[PDB]
Amino acid sequence: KNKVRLKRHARVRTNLSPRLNVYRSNKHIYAQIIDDNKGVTLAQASSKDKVELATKVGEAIAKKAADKGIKEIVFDRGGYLYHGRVKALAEAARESGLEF
Amino acid sequence: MLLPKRVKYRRQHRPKTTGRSKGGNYVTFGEFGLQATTTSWITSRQIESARIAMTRYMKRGGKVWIKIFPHTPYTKKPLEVRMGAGKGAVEGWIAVVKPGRILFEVAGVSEEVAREALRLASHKLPVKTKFVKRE
Amino acid sequence: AKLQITLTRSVIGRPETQRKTVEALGLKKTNSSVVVEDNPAIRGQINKVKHLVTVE
Amino acid sequence: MRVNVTLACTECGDRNYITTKNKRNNPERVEMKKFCSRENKQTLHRE
Amino acid sequence: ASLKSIIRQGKQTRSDLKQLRKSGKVPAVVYGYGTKNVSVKVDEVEFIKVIREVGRNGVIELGVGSKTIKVMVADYQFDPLKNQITHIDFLAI
Amino acid sequence: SSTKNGRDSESKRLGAKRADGQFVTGGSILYRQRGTKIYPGENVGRGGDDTLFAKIDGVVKFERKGRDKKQVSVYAVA
RNA sequence: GUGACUAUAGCAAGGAGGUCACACCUGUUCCCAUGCCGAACACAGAAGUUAAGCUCCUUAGCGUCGAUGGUAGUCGAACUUACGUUCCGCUAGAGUAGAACGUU
RNA sequence: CUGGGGCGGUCGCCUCCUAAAAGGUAACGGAGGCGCUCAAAGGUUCCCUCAGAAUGGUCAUUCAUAGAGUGUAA
RNA sequence: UUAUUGGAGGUAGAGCACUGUUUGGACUUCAGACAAACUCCGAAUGCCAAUUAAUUUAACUUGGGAGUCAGAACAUGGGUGAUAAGGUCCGUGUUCGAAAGGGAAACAGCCCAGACCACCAGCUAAGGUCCCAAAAUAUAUGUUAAGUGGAAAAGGAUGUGGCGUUGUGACACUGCGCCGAAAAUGUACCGGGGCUAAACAUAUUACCGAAGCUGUGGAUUGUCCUUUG
Numbered sequence: 001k002n003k004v005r006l007k008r009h010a011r012v013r014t015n016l017s018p019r020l021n022v023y024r025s026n027k028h029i030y031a032q033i034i035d036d037n038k039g040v041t042l043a044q045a046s047s048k049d050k051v052e053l054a055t056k057v058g059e060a061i062a063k064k065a066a067d068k069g070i071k072e073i074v075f076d077r078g079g080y081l082y083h084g085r086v087k088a089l090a091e092a093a094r095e096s097g098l099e100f
Numbered sequence: 101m102l103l104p105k106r107v108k109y110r111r112q113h114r115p116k117t118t119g120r121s122k123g124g125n126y127v128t129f130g131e132f133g134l135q136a137t138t139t140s141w142i143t144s145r146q147i148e149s150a151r152i153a154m155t156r157y158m159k160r161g162g163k164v165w166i167k168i169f170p171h172t173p174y175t176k177k178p179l180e181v182r183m184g185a186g187k188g189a190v191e192g193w194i195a196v197v198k199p200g201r202i203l204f205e206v207a208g209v210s211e212e213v214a215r216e217a218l219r220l221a222s223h224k225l226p227v228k229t230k231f232v233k234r235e
Numbered sequence: 236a237k238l239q240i241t242l243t244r245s246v247i248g249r250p251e252t253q254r255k256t257v258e259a260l261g262l263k264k265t266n267s268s269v270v271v272e273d274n275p276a277i278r279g280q281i282n283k284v285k286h287l288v289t290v291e
Numbered sequence: 292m293r294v295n296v297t298l299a300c301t302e303c304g305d306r307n308y309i310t311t312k313n314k315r316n317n318p319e320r321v322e323m324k325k326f327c328s329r330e331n332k333q334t335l336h337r338e
Numbered sequence: 339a340s341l342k343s344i345i346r347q348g349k350q351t352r353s354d355l356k357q358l359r360k361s362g363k364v365p366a367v368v369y370g371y372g373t374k375n376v377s378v379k380v381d382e383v384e385f386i387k388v389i390r391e392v393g394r395n396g397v398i399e400l401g402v403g404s405k406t407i408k409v410m411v412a413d414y415q416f417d418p419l420k421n422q423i424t425h426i427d428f429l430a431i
Numbered sequence: 432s433s434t435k436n437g438r439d440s441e442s443k444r445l446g447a448k449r450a451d452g453q454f455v456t457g458g459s460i461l462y463r464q465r466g467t468k469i470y471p472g473e474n475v476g477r478g479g480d481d482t483l484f485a486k487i488d489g490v491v492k493f494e495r496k497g498r499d500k501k502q503v504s505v506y507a508v509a
Numbered sequence: 510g511u512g513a514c515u516a517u518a519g520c521a522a523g524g525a526g527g528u529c530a531c532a533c534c535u536g537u538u539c540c541c542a543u544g545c546c547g548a549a550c551a552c553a554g555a556a557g558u559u560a561a562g563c564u565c566c567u568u569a570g571c572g573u574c575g576a577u578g579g580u581a582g583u584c585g586a587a588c589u590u591a592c593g594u595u596c597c598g599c600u601a602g603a604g605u606a607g608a609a610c611g612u613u
Numbered sequence: 614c615u616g617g618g619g620c621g622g623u624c625g626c627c628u629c630c631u632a633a634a635a636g637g638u639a640a641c642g643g644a645g646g647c648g649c650u651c652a653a654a655g656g657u658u659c660c661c662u663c664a665g666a667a668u669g670g671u672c673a674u675u676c677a678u679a680g681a682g683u684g685u686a687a
Numbered sequence: 688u689u690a691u692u693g694g695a696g697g698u699a700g701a702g703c704a705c706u707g708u709u710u711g712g713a714c715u716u717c718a719g720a721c722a723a724a725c726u727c728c729g730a731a732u733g734c735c736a737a738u739u740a741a742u743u744u745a746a747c748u749u750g751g752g753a754g755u756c757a758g759a760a761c762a763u764g765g766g767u768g769a770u771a772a773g774g775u776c777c778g779u780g781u782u783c784g785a786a787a788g789g790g791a792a793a794c795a796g797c798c799c800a801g802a803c804c805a806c807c808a809g810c811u812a813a814g815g816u817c818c819c820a821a822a823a824u825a826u827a828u829g830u831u832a833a834g835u836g837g838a839a840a841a842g843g844a845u846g847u848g849g850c851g852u853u854g855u856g857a858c859a860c861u862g863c864g865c866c867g868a869a870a871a872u873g874u875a876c877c878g879g880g881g882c883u884a885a886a887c888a889u890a891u892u893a894c895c896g897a898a899g900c901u902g903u904g905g906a907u908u909g910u911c912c913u914u915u916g
Binding site: 250253286 | 585586587595596
């Protein structure tokens with residue numbers, strides 16, 4: 001799937017992009033806000049730090065960004081579908097204070 | 101006599117006759133051959149005459165390869181007409197031969213029968229030639 | 236100011252860019268002679284028109 | 292074959308947005324949602 | 339077999355090569371382990387009567403560094419309209 | 432023996448319109464093309480009709496996109 | 510994970526490496542799902558397995574990179590009709606590299 | 614218009630070639646088309662990947678950088 | 688204009704990786720070819736810039752007044768024609784047009800060279816140096832016997848020289864010659880006489896040769912102010 005999840009992500013990322021990029025797994029979710037003109041990361045969030053934990057990771061990434069002084073973002077669904085887990089990952093950062 | 105079976109374009113600009121030969125300069129299919137030493141257009145009708153001479157001389161014993169093929173159709177206009185009013189009708193098919201190309205190759209024959217056959221061929225082709233043997 | 240360059244052939248019947256080069260060297264008439272400090276870029280002008288000049 | 296139709300705001304203001312339709316494949320009085328700029332609003336158009 | 343070849347040095351202009359070819363010399367190039375691309379000249383007949391002796395895929399001692407290195411003949415160009423070899427490739431080992 | 436040929440079309444002035452290293456304005460056309468022989472880089476708009484134009488005022492630069500595809504970007508001067 | 514680079518970055522082959530991650534695998538309860546099928550997308554997951562996917566290594570068969578030297582081709586002269594000098598400099602083919610580097 | 618004129622052909626627009634690697638470039642030079650068509654064949658968000666060669670009895674599998682398709686010529 | 692750099696682009700060439708044409712083998716495949724409308728490739732040049740350095744004299748805008756819209760030859764890249772035409776139609780440069788002077792015998796377009804005027808001055812360019820006709824019967828070395836030089840092919844051939852490989856003969860390049868070579872007023876395809884060097888090829892020496900350049904005088908415009916000269 002990742003050999004084709006990556007293809008849908010490269011399809012996504014032709015118009016879009018700082019990034020708030022994601023990565024699902026069988027049990028974990030790897031969120032991270034990344035610059036896209038230096039390759040630099042700005043914040044961090046993982047699952048080992050299925051929707052309760054999606055809200056957990058969303059809150060974590062949002063409060064880390066709040067410590068890091070950045071508000072307005074662009075959300076990359078990374079080629080996954082915007083639904084359920086990634087749905088909640090988007091609706092946690094808005095509810096933690098952020099711009100989508 | 102010889103001609104391609106399909107051509108995409110009946111009418112073509114005529115090939116460059118000035119320069120040297122780019123490919124087919126070394127005996128490949130056989131032992132002996134006739135190398136060209138002068139540029140011209142060889143028509144299918146005279147390619148065939150040279151082949152007939154070479155074939156009948158060897159008793160139809162040895163093997164021959166006609167290394168050149170006429171791909172290019174030259175046109176001509178009718179008897180007594182003025183210039184213009186379109187390009188003419190296909191007269192025949194020609195190959196362009198430049199200094200160094202190997203017109204015919206033979207094998208299955210000693211040097212002397214092959215030499216006389218190739219000599220008797222070179223008199224029906226509008227170019228000068230010489231006798232060549234594989235390296 | 237090395238490179239004493241003299242115009243020794245005419246420019247009648249020479250291409251026009253060549254006529255431009257020799258005038259940009261400052262050679263007015265035939266047998267005229269300009270002194271010009273040897274550059275790496277003034278030398279490239281006396282190769283466009285090597286046949287019509289004499290250098291020394 | 293194609294008619295050269297003329298749309299006309301249902302409510303207010305009329306006869307803008309010329310287009311063309313296909314009569315045999317649309318033998319009906321077509322309808323659109325266009326910007327009636329007279330009354331500065333999205334509104335229906337006919338004909 | 340034994341061959342002596344002296345280096346050609348400088349930029350080989352057009353006239354220079356056309357002088358070496360209307361004299362009886364064949365330009366050559368050498369390379370392989372330890373050779374390091376000495377552009378050389380060889381006798382246009384001596385090479386014939388050495389390679390026709392040692393055969394096509396033989397072994398040849400040349401004037402490489404004024405010493406022998408057991409060279410090969412990778413490729414060779416051949417102006418056929420005069421039957422004259424035009425360039426040789428000596429692949430060392 | 433008349434002929435059924437001869438007619439052609441008006442040639443449409445097509446291709447590069449600025450130079451690699453040149454200062455361009457905010458809406459200048461950088462290249463004209465059918466299809467995409469050169470894709471739009473950064474701050475380059477790939478307008479309709481497939482023409483490539485600049486957006487900001489800057490210096491133009493033809494780069495490549497890996498192998499077999501090249502792009503045009505525009506930069507800020509100084 | 511995630512970016513940058515012209516595959517010297519790929520293919521193809523042999524070889525090991527496990528639930529710590531990544532996987533496949535349990536199933537349709539749940540949100541959602543096929544113009545039929547939880548095959549897919551997605552949801553609830555603990556078994557079980559290193560076979561496959563896959564990270565890591567060997568390989569120069571296939572692709573890709575590719576000199577030095579020579580040749581063709583011409584820019585400009587200069588004789589005359591195809592050469593001669595100057596100068597740039599091909600493709601092809603071999604010497605070769607090469608099983609990638611790499612930012613956060 | 615016209616390799617005298619008449620007869621024949623043509624006349625506006627598009628895509629190639631000639632055209633000489635910027636653009637431009639003629640002939641009664643070599644090839645084709647146009648005088649429309651879509652209310653979804655437009656917009657937008659998502660999802661997917663073709664042609665063909667074989668193994669079988671529309672299907673399935675594999676091989677496959679594109680040889681498909683792109684309303685309509687190139 | 689040139690040097691340095693960056694660039695776009697698909698011509699020459701080349702190649703068969705795609706579309707087509709094709710030759711010989713073996714049962715898709717190995718070798719070999721072809722292309723204006725074929726491209727895995729790909730120049731030299733030309734073009735665009737830097738707001739990139741050294742020389743040089745333009746560039747542009749605004750206005751007044753125009754003529755031009757029958758072009759030609761040669762060199763090179765092509766189409767058409769028949770790789771005919773002093774043909775025709777395009778790109779590229781030059782000369783004529785609107786250009787006199789020297790050479791090509793004479794000869795708008797070929798080569799040299801751009802006339803302000805005068806001189807019974809000098810140096811040279813193309814081209815030349817036995818006489819017509821100014822200047823070498825020059826110097827060194829070789830070739831050619833046909834008057835080749837001073838017109839023409841396939842093809843032929845113990846012409847003659849050079850170098851080369853061969854076991855006295857044979858061949859591979861080769862330079863120069865021979866035959867093929869018949870037309871209409873009068874030799875009549877060196878301008879003529881004549882030429883065996885006064886031909887050819889190569890290599891240093893001289894000299895001749897223009898209205899070019901220089902020398903001397905003069906006439907006009909200009910621009911620096913050496914220094915209103």
